[PDB]
Amino acid sequence: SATGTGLVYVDAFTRFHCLWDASHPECPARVSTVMEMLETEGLLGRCVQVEARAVTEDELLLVHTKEYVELMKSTQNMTEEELKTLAEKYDSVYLHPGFFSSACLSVGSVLQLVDKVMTSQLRNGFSINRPPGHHAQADKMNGFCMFNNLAIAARYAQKRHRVQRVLIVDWDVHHGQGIQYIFEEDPSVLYFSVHRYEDGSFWPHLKESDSSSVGSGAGQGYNINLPWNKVGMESGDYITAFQQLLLPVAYEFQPQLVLVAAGFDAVIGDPLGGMQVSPECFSILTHMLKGVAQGRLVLALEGGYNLQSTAEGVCASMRSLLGDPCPHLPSSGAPCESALKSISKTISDLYPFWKSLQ
Ligand SMILES: CC(C)[C@H](C(=O)Nc1ccc(C(=O)NO)cc1)c1ccccc1
Ligand SMILES: [K+]
Ligand SMILES: [K+]
Ligand SMILES: [Zn+2]
C-alpha cells in the first residue's frame, strides 16, 4: 500500500559463493540470516513483498560499458579455472557461474523498489541483495561487486521517472569509490560516503577517499567524503556526522529520491570493519534520512560480514522504515575527538559549495 515498506529477496541471491576460499566473508549466509531475523522479529510480515527482476542490457549501459557487460555475461559459461583467471585481473573479487545471474537480479531488485517508491505505491523499501554494488566501476569488477546497483538505480530514476536530483548516502564502512567515479562530474547526483580510511591504510587505499575529493567540473561540490582515521567509531560519531554535515547539505540539495548504500560492516562485531556502531544506531540514521525527498528512501544491502550484526542492523533500519519510534541509545550521542577532527575537515573542504555549511 501507499504507506508501506517494500522488501525484495529472492533465493537466487544465495546461489553463488567463492569456489576457492571456503572462508570468504562475502557468502550466501549473509542474506539468509538477514531474512531469518526479519521473520523472527516479525518485521518481514509487516513489509510488502516486491518481486525482483533481472536488469536489462540497456539499464546496465546507463553506467557500464558494452564490452564490460558482455565480458561479465560470458562468465556464466566459464570453467572454475577461467573464472579465477578473470577474477584475478580485478582487485578483491571472486567469480562463480551464477554470479552474473545473481548480479542482474541484485540490480533489478533496486530498480523494482525505485518504481514502487517513485509512483507512491510504497513509501520506502529495502532490497536484501547480494552481490553488493558500490565498488563496481564502468568497466571493471572491484571489491566483491560486479555491477553498481545504486549508480544504475540513480540514473534509472532520472531516465525513467524523470527525477532531477538523487542523493546517495553510503554508510558502509568502505568508500564506494565506484559511485564517486561514476558521478564525479555530475551535480544531479550528490554522493556522501562515511568510511574507514586511516590515511589510506585501510582498503581500498585511495588518495581520493579523502575529503579533498569534492567532485570536478559541473560536479564540483557534489561529492562528500567523511574519512575516519581511527578505529572504534560509535553511534555518536555517525549521528553527529549526519547532524553537522549530511542533513544540512541534503536539505539544501533538495533531493527527490534518496538511495542508501546500506552496508553493515561498521556494526560492532564485524570481522573487518573495525568500528563499534550499535545496530540500533541504524534506526536513528534511517530516521534522519526520511525528512527529505518526501520520504522516498530505498536501502540496498552492500557489505557487512558478521551474520548476526548485519541482520541486527538491517532489522534496526527496517523498524524505522516501517515507522516505529526510534529506540533510546545508551550513549550520549557526543562524538570522539578523532571523529570531530574528520567532520571539521570535511566541512572545511566542502564549505565553498554549500551555504548550509557557511
Ligand atoms: C585482502 C583484503 C583487503 C580483502 C578485502 O577485505 N576486501 C573487501 C572489499 C570490499 C568490502 C566491502 O564490504 N565493501 O563495501 C569488504 C572487503 C579480502 C579479499 C578476500 C577475502 C577476504 C578479504
Ligand atoms: K561508505
Ligand atoms: K556527484
Ligand atoms: Zn564494505
Automatic annotation (TrEMBL):
GO CC, alphabetical: axon; centrosome; cytoplasm; cytosol; dendrite; nucleus; perikaryon
Primary location recorded for the protein, binned into one broad class: other
Superkingdom of the organism of origin: Eukaryota
Positions with a binding annotation for Zn(2+) 1: 172, 174, 265
GO biological process terms held by the UniProt record: angiogenesis; chromatin organization; definitive hemopoiesis; hematopoietic progenitor cell differentiation; mitochondrion localization; negative regulation of cellular component organization; positive regulation of cellular component organization; regulation of microtubule-based process
Subcellular locations according to the entry: Cell projection, Axon; Cell projection, Dendrite; Cytoplasm, Cytoskeleton, Cilium basal body; Cytoplasm, Cytoskeleton, Microtubule organizing center, Centrosome
Gene Ontology molecular functions: actin binding; deacetylase activity; potassium ion binding; protein lysine deacetylase activity; transferase activity; tubulin deacetylase activity; zinc ion binding
Keyword terms, alphabetized: Actin-binding, Cell projection, Chromatin regulator, Cytoplasm, Cytoskeleton, Hydrolase, Metal-binding, Methylation, Nucleus, Phosphoprotein, Repeat, Repressor, Transcription, Transcription regulation, Transferase, Ubl conjugation, Ubl conjugation pathway, Zinc, Zinc-finger
Signal peptide: none
Keyword Membrane appears in the UniProt entry: no
Family, as annotated: Belongs to the histone deacetylase family. HD type 2 subfamily.
Name of this chain's protein: Protein deacetylase HDAC6
